[PDB]
Amino acid sequence: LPAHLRLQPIYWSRDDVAQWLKWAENEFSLRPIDSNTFEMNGKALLLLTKEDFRYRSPHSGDELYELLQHILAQPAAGDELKINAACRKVQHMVVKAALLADKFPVLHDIGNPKAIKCVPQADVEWKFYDAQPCSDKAYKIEELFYSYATHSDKFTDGVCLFWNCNVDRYPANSIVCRFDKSAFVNLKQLPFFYYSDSPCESHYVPLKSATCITRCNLGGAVCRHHANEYRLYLDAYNMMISAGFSLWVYKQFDTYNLWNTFTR
Ligand SMILES: Nc1ncnc2c1ncn2[C@@H]1O[C@H](CSCC[C@H](N)C(=O)O)[C@@H](O)[C@H]1O
Ligand SMILES: [Zn+2]
Q1: Which domain holds residue 18?
Q2: The domain that contains 29 carries what CATH number?
Q3: Nearest atom (ligand 1) to Cα of 118
Q4: How far is the CA of 181 from the centre of ligand 1 (A)?
Q5: Where does Zn(2+) 16 bind?
């Protein structure tokens, strides 16, 4: 029932595992066990044997192991509303970062039928294209079905955005999100990062992470504000990846360009 427990268990934190024990206690009327009977994250939980479960909880371990196997076999539903919002959070993060890092003068938003910019504050010429534009936004959307075989020498200025616009093959100058390899040969996988240029504020478990690209992490002392925002962003990102989306980017994408935005 708890939101994190709808992620695949490989994404569960140590705290998530504890909430899982409490949920299972109530759902199955099990003997209450101490909250750190399984003091590990989900990745670790998945490495335990059924015998390890029984030793760890003589009264409920076998049940807990079998519950985990059922969760692994029939993954949780997942809420479309929350997953949508998570995907939009990531879209804004990634496209904002790309525009700041590489200063593209034009963005070709291919498969956007509503003519909405995911980074409306960016200094860039935003152009929209779609095979079936919404009739109430078609006046500013180019009606176009993208195929690499037909369009690979077009849209060569700036960057192209294909946010869940599944085409035969993406051009080299692209930012892509795709739901579940030859389509991606011109691109590389985009690893997780968090970038923020919002002001630091100090008033948490300290956040240690090389992927928190903030002014306060230049010296490894992330402020409370960016610690909180990083963890919220990571939760959204996990929701997206656990649901089956994958991110791809032009091969020159470099997070050091983001560190450099801090003058440093
Ligand atoms: N080959 C193609 N060329 C242009 N648009 C395409 C396309 N294949 C699918 N589409 C369009 O891509 C959209 C996918 S759904 C909307 C995706 C949008 N980028 C978003 O993030 O909300 C639809 O509007 C559909 O008409
Ligand atoms: Zn900060």
Answers
A1: 3-73
A2: 1.10.150.50
A3: 21
A4: 19
A5: 200, 216, 223, 226
